[PDB]
A and B are shown apart, each in its own frame.
Chain A
Amino acid sequence: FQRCLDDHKYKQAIGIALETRRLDVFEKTILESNDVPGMLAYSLKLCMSLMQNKQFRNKVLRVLVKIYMNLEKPDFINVCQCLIFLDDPQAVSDILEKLVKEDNLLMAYQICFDLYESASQQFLSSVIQNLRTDQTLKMIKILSGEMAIELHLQFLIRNNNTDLMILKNTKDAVRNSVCHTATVIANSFMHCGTTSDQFLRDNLEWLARATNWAKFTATASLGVIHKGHEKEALQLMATYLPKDTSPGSAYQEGGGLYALGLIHANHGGDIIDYLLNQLKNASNDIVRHGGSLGLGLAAMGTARQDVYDLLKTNLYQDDAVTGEAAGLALGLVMLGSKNAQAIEDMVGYAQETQHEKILRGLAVGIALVMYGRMEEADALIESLCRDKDPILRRSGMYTVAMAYCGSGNNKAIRRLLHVAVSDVNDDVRRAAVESLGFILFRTPEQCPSVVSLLSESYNPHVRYGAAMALGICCAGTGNKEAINLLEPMTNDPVNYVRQGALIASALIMIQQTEITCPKVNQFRQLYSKVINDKHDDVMAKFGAILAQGILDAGGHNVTISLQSRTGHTHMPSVVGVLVFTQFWFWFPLSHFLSLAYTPTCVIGLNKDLKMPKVQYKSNCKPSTFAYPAPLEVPKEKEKEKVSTAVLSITAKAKKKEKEKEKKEEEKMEVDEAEKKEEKEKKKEPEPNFQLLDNPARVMPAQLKVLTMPETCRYQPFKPLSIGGIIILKDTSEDIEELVEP
């Protein structure tokens, strides 16, 4: 190592220093002489990307924050890149109280936004308890995440690019089947978070045609449109109460309660208490669904005891139909908890009951009670796989997915795929090969190489979960190798594996134009083909209409990503996607994918209210992309002719007629002309410097090619190469131009 000191190159030194687990040698190579003090930026990504163990990982991560505190400026990156992994609540609260104490409310204002976007529930609830132990009330709201929601609501109400006619050209092709549910899940997706009501307004008699569970689904879709609508939604569905809609319709009032849960997800308030008091005073059966699904969704990740107690005595009712309702919600309130009583009561209750709906609700629930434990589940992981209950073996496969999310464990991928080949039920073979993407989504290079040969199996159940493994591993990238695999998958003989190929195709290419990847316009007309064909299966075209809703979700402004901004992983985008895969067993679980709709936006709010109108531009390399025009080109074709092929004596007859024009045309008068190259002229001087205001949609590809106006004086604070929210460093004087609709 002294030779590595005599190297003067110290990345050679830092290799051995992390091999032999010694850490004072680690500290000295960064507190060396002045040779690039951003070696910590190399070492952070080195510990971020390729560290398998977690036992000494936090130790190396917290010997980093010793030199970050000993660095000149503490605030910027070290908290939300290290301490949220190291989950120290009061360490964050104290040093941010330090940052307020020197009267520095500009960068503490930044780090609270970055903390709320990245870090999870109950870490923010724990730090905000140690907050209150004004500008303090300013940092209450931006750590409780209040005003981040309304600006996110402000972005989507300003920007809305949906073609109304696309859903009209699918609506008229719907026969008297139960594709009405497939349409109302489509417009809810592509008006999610928009608060736009026109399809629940104009064709309202058509909406009243489908019944008895579409009424449950359609009024659940109403909560999807009003996602993040905190106070205005409670007075909105103060029209459709659980005692004012209809004394004969419980599906109306049941899905209303589930719609309140879809609005206020990850938001504690009176609505938890309001939904708790209506599970006290409840009707017979199908008020207890959307009550419990809504209540477990609003109390997700809270580990709240009082709601957890009554969901048990809801579960021990042994009612057949609320068993799916209770078991899903019982896991959501204990998500990532690792409780003694929760696993034991739910795996205890999973045998003496005599239905299997009750098993399927508790299937996902006991998989979701543990989340990212990474070694701490293996006694339960082994015990669920050994049992002779096929649903409980299937649930153990979801559990090993959710405990090992984003880790390249060889022990996972060995054990998870050994049962994929060997096991005798086919449903457990799916959830084996559906768990592939949950553990490998962080490195999407491997998932085409490992699922491609399983996509050509002999049974369709392996080929089904092969297709949705591509949909979840490569989440929203332009991978095009997964698209290369899905091309014969959507042309399968079996119907439901065609369905899964359509939905996985819709997941991979959201917000991607033709120049981004060429297979976009191939698949949009392919969706159009199998939705306008009359002799295809309803189940085969169910995925097609749902692929319409995914592909333009939120008016080309939201996206899905299990991966977050700052290297951290989402808890809602993982829970939102896997309970969405339980749409075979229950269609109204399809609303849960709206939890994973993360926005594509940059907002330059510098003060608490001040969002200045700042025009800044991108520098896309030869041309433009991004968020195209709607297509209104139905047809107007004409048969109009059959060409006269008379090659008889006409041939010499027309020739002597052309001689008759050689006396008439060139000897009396002829002059007519037109000008060339006017239409070629305007194309080449084009931009690639497109200025943008700051409600600004931005692709996650073009985050790196956008540039602040250096000719403008107002510069941002954070390095502006990644989308989300930043603050402006407002320099001079005379600030104006605030805008709110």
Chain B
Amino acid sequence: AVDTAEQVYISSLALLKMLKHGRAGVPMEVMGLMLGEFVDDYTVRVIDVFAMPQSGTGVSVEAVDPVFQAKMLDMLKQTGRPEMVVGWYHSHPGFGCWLSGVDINTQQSFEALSERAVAVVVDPIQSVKGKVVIDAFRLINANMMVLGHEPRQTTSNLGHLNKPSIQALIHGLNRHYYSITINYRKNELEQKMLLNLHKKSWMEGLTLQDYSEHCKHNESVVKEMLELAKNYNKAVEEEDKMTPEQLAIKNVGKQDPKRHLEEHVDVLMTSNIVQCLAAMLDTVVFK
């Protein structure tokens, strides 16, 4: 009767509440709760997230307001769905993810009340480009000091999802808390409505951008393509046995012969065909 390599399901609606509320209070380490359902032994899901009003103390047990707790829970019972809290989260701007000394005390409070009460750490200002620095953790006992901490078992999906990173194992990993895996309860009718509604253009699909800047851009490429063709003349008529496999490798420069070549030929091709093909269709369609 001990832990495994578990799994955490977060909803798509949760994640947008997470890193918007973190981006809102970017200097001041925002705080919120995590509301889901312990579905079995070693998977867990969370469907919903609401925030917390911020105190002068910061992320601690005192920022948990019990009168804001029960009143917010009450007005979610009759509208939407009532369920149990399953954890909490906070924002660490200046660094990626690890439980601090005040973070570890408020984890003790919830794991004594609840079953496991998974924490979540989100860095909003690091999570920028195409990846999110979000991680979830769980506090481990000191009673298993003569036994295997992280009591994992019969599975081969522990070596995936992260090796324990050096900036996180310098803190209480892996002798105070352990990491836990995250994948997304991702479904159709939410995937397609976020795809098709954020990036779409209907009447733009047959516009013209007409010709005063299009045919001007047809001058804008050809001119240096002339000079780059003269540079293409230079290397090909050179053609000396200067050990030519070494002569090609000592002058890689993202440069003339093929790299700075037909790339332009592609852009001249794609711009003019899509222009002229849309021009012939508008004559066809409109009378």
Which residues of A approach B to under 8 Å, CB–CB?
A: 176-178, 181, 212-213, 217, 320-321, 354-357, 388, 495-496, 499, 537-539, 542, 583-588
The smallest C-beta distance from B186 to any residue of chain A, in angstroms, reads 10
Closest 6 CB pairs of A and B: A587-B154, A320-B40, A584-B156, A539-B159, A213-B153, A388-B188
Q: How far is it, in angstroms, between the C-alpha of A213 and the C-alpha of B3 when the chains are bound?
A: 11
Say if the beta carbon of B43 comes within 8 Å of chain A.
Answer: yes
Q: Which residue of B lies closest to A356 (CB)?
A: B43
- Interface residue? B79 (CB, 8 A): no
* Known interface pairs A178-B148, A212-B2, A388-B187; A355-B40 also in contact (CB < 8 Å): yes
- Nearest B residue to A358 by beta-carbon distance? B40
User: Chain B residues with Cβ under 8 A from A539's Cβ?
Assistant: 156, 158-159
Q: When the two chains form the complex, which single residue of B43, B152, B160 contacts A355, counting CB atoms closer than 8 Å?
A: B43
**Is residue B252 within 8 Å, beta carbon to beta carbon, of the partner chain?**
no
Q: Tell me whether B187 and A355 are in contact (CB under 8 A).
A: no
CA of A586 to CA of B154 in the docked complex: distance in angstroms? 5
Taking CB atoms, residues of chain A closer than 8 Å to B155 are 584-587
B157 within 8 A of A: yes
Pairwise interchain contact B41-A320, C-beta atoms closer than 8 A: yes
- In the complex, which residues of chain B have a beta carbon less than 8 angstroms from the beta carbon of A356? 43
Q: How far is the CB of A149 from chain B (nearest CB, A)?
A: 30
> In the bound complex, how far is the Cα of B152 from the Cα of A586, in angstroms?
12
Known contacts A355-B40, A495-B159: A176-B154 contact under CB 8 Å: no
The interface size of chain B toward A, counting residues with CB under 8 Å, comes to: 19
A536 → chain B closest CB, angstroms: 12
Tell me the minimal C-beta distance from A461 to chain B in angstroms: 10
Say yes or no: A537-B41 contact (C-beta < 8 A), given A212-B153, A217-B154, A388-B188. no
Q: Which secondary structure characterizes the binding site on chain B?
A: loop
Q: Is B70 an interface residue (CB 8 A)?
A: no
Provide the residues of chain B in CB contact with A588, threshold 8 Å.
154
Residues of B within 8 Å of A496, CB to CB, are 156, 159-160
Q: Does B39 contact A (CB under 8 A)?
A: yes
Residues of B within 8 A of A495 (CB): 159
For A217, the chain B residues whose CB sits under 8 A away are: 154
Q: Give the residue name and chain of the B residue nearest to A584 (CB).
A: B156
A75–B160 Cα distance when bound, in Å, is 58
Residue on A nearest B153 in the bound complex, by CB: A213
CB distance from A428 to the nearest CB of B (A): 14
A539 and B160 alpha carbons, distance in the complex (Å): 10
Measured in the bound complex, the distance between the Cα atoms of B9 and A355 in whole Å is: 11
Contact of A181 (CB < 8 Å), options: B1, B39, B154, B187: B154
A320 to chain B, nearest CB (A): 4
Cβ-defined partner of B157 (8 Å) among A177, A355, A538, A584: A584
| A321 near B157: Cβ-Cβ < 8 Å | no
Contact B2 A355 (CB under 8 A): no
Q: How far is the CA of A630 from the CA of B187 in the complex (A)?
A: 57
Chain A residues near B39 (CB-CB < 8 A): 320, 354-355
- State how many angstroms separate the Cβ of B188 from the closest Cβ of chain A: 5
Per-residue CB contact flags for chain B residues 155-174 toward chain A (1 = under 8 Å, else 0) read 11111100000000000000
Contacts of B159 in A (CB 8 A): 495-496, 537-539
- In the complex, how many angstroms separate the beta carbon of A289 from the nearest chain B beta carbon? 11
Q: For residues 156 through 203 of chain B, which have their beta carbon under 8 Å from a beta carbon of chain A?
A: 156-160, 187-188
